[PDB]
């Protein structure tokens, strides 16, 4: 149940999303990651921004220890945050992630966002007016530092996240390119199916990875309350009675049947165990056709703050 990445490695088409708001106890990330694995999840998705790589990496040591899994069975992903885009900060940032999670290597290291921010440790640099500070960085140099990380062995694979077609091409069409990005993790759901972006990636043998596939966690910090609730859509709810599953299962299945590796975030035991049931049924071609027409180019992560960035993925 994996896809072959363009570098020879295999990615499990079902990933577990480990992000949770700060007000949530960090101990939960540890617990739920154990649950997730016990449920069947082998693909695990993290980042330095999440502030949970210590607990996630811990939960993996636990499952390898008790004999539930070996390291070669677990697909672990981390992300270089926007404040470490400068070439000299890439590897040290990676090693930092590797340390917290106490791992030798990460199966996948991505560029979290193309929107570079002020170099430093603070993850949200703000001027004296409380405005987020940007930084100008040639993302092609950042990718070079990522390629050195794959050769250095610290990362089995490298890809991008929140990259639009343009920025993506800047990589592919970059001189002396050693490794194409294996994938591009972006927001993707029936209200925002990235039909066109997905098409482009496939021609380049790159894998679109979908986040917010279940409508997002709807944080009050980026998500507008007046936006539609994905898992309450008439078409999805109706198809759910048809196949006698759940709207979340329909959303996830939708992604699988069209060549998209999809992430599912859940800190609830029974909703984690339910999410793996995505492999137990299949929507019809007409169902796929019906869902394909749910797109309203609606991305839940809506910060007009970043819109002012020259690398703002959307335009
Ligand atoms: N690259 C990026 O910029 C980026 C941005 C956002 C997210 N991501 C990644 O994508 C992962 C998931 O995306 P997401 O953060 O928006 O979470 P999500 O996949 O969109 O799902 C969000 C909500 O869905 C609920 N849910 C999950 N399974 C369900 C089920 N079977 N039935 C009903 N409800 C269910 C969860 O509630 P409960 O938890 O209470 O079950 C969760 O709060 C994240 O963990 C993160 O790793 C990446
Ligand atoms: O990964 C998480 O779970 C996560 C959680 C909180 C915030 C972000 N930040 C973010 C930054 C830029 C973009 C984008 F896409 F606009 F560039 C989208 C999200 C990601």
């Amino acid at each position: 149940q994996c896809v072959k990445l363009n570098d020879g490695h295999f990615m499990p088409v079902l990933g577990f999303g480990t992000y949770a708001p700060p007000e949530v106890p960090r101990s939960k990330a540890l617990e739920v990651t154990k649950l997730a694995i016990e449920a069947g999840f082998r693909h695990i998705d993290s980042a330095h921004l999440y502030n949970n790589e210590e607990q996630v990496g811990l939960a993996i040591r636990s499952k390898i220890a008790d004999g539930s899994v070996k390291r070669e069975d677990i697909f672990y992903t981390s992300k270089l945050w926007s404040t470490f885009h400068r070439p000299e900060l890439v590897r040290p940032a990676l090693e930092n992630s590797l340390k917290k999670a106490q791992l030798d290597y990460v199966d996948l290291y991505l560029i979290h966002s193309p929107m570079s921010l002020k170099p430093g440790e603070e993850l949200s640099p703000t001027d004296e007016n409380g405005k987020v500070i940007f930084d100008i960085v040639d993302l092609c140099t950042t990718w070079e530092a990522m390629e050195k990380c794959k050769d250095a062995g610290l990362a089995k694979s490298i890809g991008v996240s929140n990259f639009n077609r343009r920025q993506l091409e800047m990589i592919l069409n970059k001189p002396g390119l050693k490794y194409k990005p294996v994938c591009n993790q972006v927001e993707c759901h029936p209200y925002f199916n990235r039909s066109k972006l997905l098409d482009f990636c496939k021609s380049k043998d790159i894998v679109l990875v979908a986040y917010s596939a279940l409508g997002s966690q709807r944080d009050k910090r980026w998500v507008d309350p007046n936006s539609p609730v994905l898992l309450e859509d008439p078409v999805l709810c109706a198809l759910a009675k048809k196949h006698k599953r759940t709207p979340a299962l329909i959303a996830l299945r939708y992604q699988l049947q069209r060549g998209v590796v999809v992430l599912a975030k859940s800190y609830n035991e029974q909703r984690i165990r339910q999410n793996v049931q995505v492999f137990e049924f299949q929507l019809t071609a007409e169902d796929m056709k019906a869902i394909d027409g749910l797109d309203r180019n609606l991305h839940y992560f809506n910060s007009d703050s970043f819109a002012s960035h020259p690398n703002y993925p959307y335009s």
Side-chain angles (χ1 to χ4, degrees), residues 123-266:
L123 306 178
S124 292
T126 59
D127 60 9
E128 17 73 27
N129 276 297
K131 182 189 183 304
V132 173
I133 313 178
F134 304 141
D135 185 18
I136 312 309
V137 171
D138 176 13
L139 290 184
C140 292
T141 76
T142 309
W143 183 254
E144 276 166 340
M146 303 279 292
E147 294 176 327
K148 303 176 188 300
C149 289
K150 175 177 169 59
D151 294 329
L154 303 183
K156 300 288 186 177
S157 300
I158 51 181
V160 297
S161 179
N162 291 317
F163 278 48
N164 60 45
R165 183 198 173 109
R166 259 214 50 86
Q167 294 152 341
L168 197 48
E169 291 177 325
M170 264 170 50
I171 307 302
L172 310 181
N173 299 323
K174 172 244 176 188
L177 177 59
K178 183 161 190 172
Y179 300 111
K180 290 186 298 182
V182 293
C183 71
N184 184 16
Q185 180 184 136
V186 295
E187 176 162 5
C188 175
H189 47 96
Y191 288 163
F192 190 38
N193 65 44
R194 323 301 296 264
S195 172
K196 294 171 288 296
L197 185 57
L198 178 57
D199 278 12
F200 175 74
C201 293
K202 293 181 178 177
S203 64
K204 310 297 181 178
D205 190 24
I206 307 180
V207 164
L208 191 168
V209 183
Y211 73 72
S212 291
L214 298 180
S216 93
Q217 299 189 43
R218 303 183 66 89
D219 258 49
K220 63 176 289 70
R221 299 185 295 174
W222 303 278
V223 182
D224 175 23
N226 292 358
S227 69
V229 187
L230 182 87
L231 299 180
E232 288 185 0
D233 183 281
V235 177
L236 304 178
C237 293
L239 292 163
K241 305 163 190 168
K242 180 195 176 186
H243 301 272
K244 307 182 182 183
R245 300 286 173 176
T246 66
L249 272 165
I250 305 300
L252 294 178
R253 187 63 197 179
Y254 169 76
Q255 301 294 357
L256 287 186
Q257 297 193 189
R258 71 187 202 137
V260 174
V261 176
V262 68
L263 299 166
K265 179 276 177 179
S266 183

Side-chain angles (χ1 to χ4, degrees), residues 7 42 64 68 119 188 191 241 245 281 294:
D7 72 356
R42 294 296 177 260
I64 299 178
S68 293
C188 175
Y191 288 163
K241 305 163 190 168
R245 300 286 173 176
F281 82 98
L294 284 164

